[PDB]
Amino acid sequence: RPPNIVLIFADDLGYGDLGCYGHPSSTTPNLDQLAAGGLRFTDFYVPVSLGTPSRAALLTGRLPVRMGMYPGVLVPSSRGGLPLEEVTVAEVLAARGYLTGMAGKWHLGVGPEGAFLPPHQGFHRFLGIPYSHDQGPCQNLTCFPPATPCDGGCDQGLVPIPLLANLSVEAQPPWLPGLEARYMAFAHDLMADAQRQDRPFFLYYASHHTHYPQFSGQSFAERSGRGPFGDSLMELDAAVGTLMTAIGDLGLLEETLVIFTADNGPETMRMSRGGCSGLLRCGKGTTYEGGVREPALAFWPGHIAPGVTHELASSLDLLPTLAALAGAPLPNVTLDGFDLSPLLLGTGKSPRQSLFFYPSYPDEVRGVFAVRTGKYKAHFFTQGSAHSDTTADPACHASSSLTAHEPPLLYDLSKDPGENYNLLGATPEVLQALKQLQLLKAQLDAAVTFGPSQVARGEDPALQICCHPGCTPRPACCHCP
Amino acid sequence: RPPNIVLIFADDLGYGDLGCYGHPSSTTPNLDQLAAGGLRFTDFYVPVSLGTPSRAALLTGRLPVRMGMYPGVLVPSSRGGLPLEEVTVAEVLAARGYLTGMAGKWHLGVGPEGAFLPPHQGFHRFLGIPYSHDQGPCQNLTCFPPATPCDGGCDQGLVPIPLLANLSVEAQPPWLPGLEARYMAFAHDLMADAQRQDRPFFLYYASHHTHYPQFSGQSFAERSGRGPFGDSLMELDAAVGTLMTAIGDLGLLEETLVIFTADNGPETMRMSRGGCSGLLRCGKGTTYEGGVREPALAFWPGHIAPGVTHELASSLDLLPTLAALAGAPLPNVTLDGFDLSPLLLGTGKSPRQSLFFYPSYPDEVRGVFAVRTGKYKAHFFTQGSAHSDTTADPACHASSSLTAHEPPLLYDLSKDPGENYNLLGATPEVLQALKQLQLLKAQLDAAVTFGPSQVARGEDPALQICCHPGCTPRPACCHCP
Ligand SMILES: *[C@H]1O[C@H](CO)[C@@H](O[C@@H]2O[C@H](CO)[C@@H](O)[C@H](O)[C@H]2NC(C)=O)[C@H](O)[C@H]1NC(C)=O
Ligand SMILES: *[C@H]1O[C@H](CO)[C@@H](O[C@@H]2O[C@H](CO)[C@@H](O)[C@H](O)[C@H]2NC(C)=O)[C@H](O)[C@H]1NC(C)=O
Ligand SMILES: [Mg+2]
Ligand SMILES: [Mg+2]
């Protein structure tokens, strides 16, 4: 009965990059066709616009500050990770008899002997990199075949990037141009095996596209009309087409729910090798709309009618929506998301009315930075980010320091999705929204306790993964292509 | 059964002016002796530190913004006044059979044909001035006998100040040096008449001391050791001694509850002819402690034991406390005060935990300026005032513009009653108080609707009281000494 679920999650992909979201030069045919036969969201969000906190909110349905996933992101030597008491979507579904698998980027911790890796958090199978593909030296890696080097060199002084098969190093570093093929092969096996055992599968595909540095296989190099950022987006798009064909071939089209979203806004610091937030303001690292609002598509033939919704939805609602769909019971913890099945099935409206946004570096004195309720969004604090540097808007830059706003900056997103015109710079409708927004912020700030910081547990270079354990000299000896 | 109640309310009198509150040169023997045989409050407050809003909160037990008593104060030509639907303490007690009377300053409105004057708000008898004694020309009035003129001239272009007997002009202007004697005579008659009819009395004595310009009868001129401000405080003090003697003479000491407080902090703009907030900061016109915290004494032999309380109390609690004491039922409206009888009778604690402070000029976008809960006080907005000009502290001056604080300025008043050291300039106790304070402000701001402004209804010079109605030329012809 339960449907097969495929969750595709891109990296550093903006609201404005898909062809079907208006980009003028992107090449995204498979995703455009998924949009045309399914539900496209205009108002779907993540609560925090950084890699780690966003992946944690997705898998647990819980605001990242509750389990210490702040500040910033995790690094290869981090001691901390997503606590093992947290229940993930993979576990909710595993206990209901799903065969669960994950391909790609984890970024939720490695820890002493890989205690925080995926196999310990409900995934039966796992093929991927445990953090971002730029958190290790890349001046000698090939990003585009036959021999175009990755640009800029990535993070120095670390072990090369490891490709893992569950808990074992399969390659270090992997060959970037062939990663996609590896991941499609893995996905195909997971599907077929689940079919054979008469059980539903759950595929978590956490792509490295479109994070820096850009790369692709040889079928896409110089073929998109948007340079390296495009080639890489085009490969991600072809991966979606490949998964849809594999779902075709096995006669599972009407029994599989396919969801596509992305973790956080574009890193405009990469300039034309980085994403695009379209009409929205600023990008990764900020609580402006270009940082937190992402593309989101839902496709399930004969169940989800083709259309466009403007209803409020969050990555936080994915656990409870998927549980409900699979007839799995919810964990016994406070959750911050809701079941969106009525909306998906067209029998009801989204139950979500409000959204809460935390910054990259949160603190308990300040609390939530921005809150949206209906079409209104208030900003109590504003701050630019180096990840959103280089565009013409000065509020996006790292030089825009942390600034308090009281009364808050107040925008009507139905008319000013670009956050250009502060309404408080009077009306009874506005005043009532203002008072609601202020009370929602004070209620959440008083009820939420911050879990102890995982990131502040520190770093220990002995925690880096090494293909040749015991090796010397570290870290350059750790390798095995 | 119900006790006789005498409520003495001074004008522009600071926390630091009574001898029993530490002043080094004031002469206040009767009040010091009342303090020595009764209850002295260290933490008693008014919600707004201006004449009109404070008198409204006292008589109704309701925050002044609910019935439009803002912004600023009322003037002789004001069209507005305290709405007649509001229920006052005088009415609560009149309906329980009290013989009620008021001597002194009203400042709650005059209106077309004196519709807002005291006789329409539950007082049986009324002898006094309908607004402050400086809201009319005083360059020719004698402030101190035999012929010392009032200093500075007061407000120009208006009708002289009227002394009224219910709704009729008894004199215009009155002779300042003999006002006290008039008021004591009136008080004595009210007491005796109530005794004779076997009924309890309620005397509301709203003194003009110690508002500018200072004045006194001849027994006090140049006799205090603190100049004109002192002479005037000394007369107010002798008035209290006279009322206590009159209560003695009629054998009513153990059957009468006597309360003394003041409406708002000192006007330091008058320099050494103005009051003193002692250790507290700033004065009239501000939401700093020297503006809102006043002297307060309760005396009732054989019922209230002599002592000092630090418990929280407000002018807002006087209606409900007096109702309860007289066995009178409370009006059917939302009240913002509580019954303090247990505290007064020494059988319980004050039920009040929090206090809310509004500025002279409030608005619905900003809401409450400052909130106190337990020993903590947060300031969300700060602002100086011309009424608090001339001292060495720059935050008190009119040049200190309206400033938002987020996070708020946070003080521990048990250790820093002077509001000098911001705690947020960390601890778990502090953080919990912070979150409580923020939530209390957002709850009150969301629940309180501002009543339509009475003061903004405008002015009409035809509303000025005239001893010779029809007169010309106005306003100088209006007079009758
Ligand atoms: C690591 O672990 C999984 C299982 O723990 C490995 O896979 C299994 O895959 C083969 C066929 O592909 C089956 O015969 C087994 O039954 C599978 N087990 C389960 C529980 O599914 C796999 O080689 C590794 N994960 C991947 C795909 O890298
Ligand atoms: C105006 O009104 C009151 C009454 O409305 C006047 O006073 C009364 O006072 C005399 C004795 O002083 C009594 O004989 C009457 O019974 C009183 N009436 C009440 C209801 O108390 C008074 O002259 C005026 N008020 C004052 C004192 O100025
Ligand atoms: Mg990312
Ligand atoms: Mg006053």
Tab-separated table of N, CA and C in Angstrom, chain A residues 17 19 22-28 224-227 230:
chain	number	residue	atom	x	y	z
A	17	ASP	N	16.859	29.535	-10.492
A	17	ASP	CA	17.695	28.769	-11.464
A	17	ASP	C	16.981	27.788	-12.371
A	19	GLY	N	14.517	26.261	-15.212
A	19	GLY	CA	13.937	26.816	-16.424
A	19	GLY	C	12.457	27.192	-16.158
A	22	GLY	N	11.702	30.450	-14.409
A	22	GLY	CA	12.029	31.630	-15.188
A	22	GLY	C	13.410	31.876	-15.726
A	23	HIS	N	14.393	31.019	-15.329
A	23	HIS	CA	15.743	31.349	-15.842
A	23	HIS	C	15.780	31.383	-17.316
A	24	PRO	N	16.435	32.374	-17.927
A	24	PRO	CA	16.576	32.476	-19.343
A	24	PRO	C	17.634	31.608	-20.026
A	25	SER	N	18.585	31.028	-19.264
A	25	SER	CA	19.562	30.238	-20.042
A	25	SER	C	19.785	28.859	-19.427
A	26	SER	N	19.283	28.526	-18.252
A	26	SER	CA	19.426	27.207	-17.699
A	26	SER	C	18.827	26.178	-18.692
A	27	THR	N	19.334	24.947	-18.608
A	27	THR	CA	18.833	23.804	-19.395
A	27	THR	C	18.418	22.755	-18.379
A	28	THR	N	17.114	22.659	-18.104
A	28	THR	CA	16.549	21.760	-17.113
A	28	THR	C	15.268	21.102	-17.639
A	224	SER	N	25.569	22.974	-21.733
A	224	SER	CA	24.438	23.797	-21.278
A	224	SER	C	24.671	25.175	-21.913
A	225	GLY	N	23.730	26.095	-21.929
A	225	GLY	CA	24.195	27.409	-22.475
A	225	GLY	C	24.568	28.348	-21.324
A	226	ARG	N	24.883	27.899	-20.117
A	226	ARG	CA	25.178	28.778	-18.979
A	226	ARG	C	26.515	28.502	-18.291
A	227	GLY	N	27.502	28.009	-19.043
A	227	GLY	CA	28.838	27.737	-18.514
A	227	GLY	C	28.847	26.628	-17.472
A	230	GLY	N	25.892	25.995	-15.291
A	230	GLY	CA	24.826	25.357	-16.058
A	230	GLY	C	25.110	23.875	-16.322
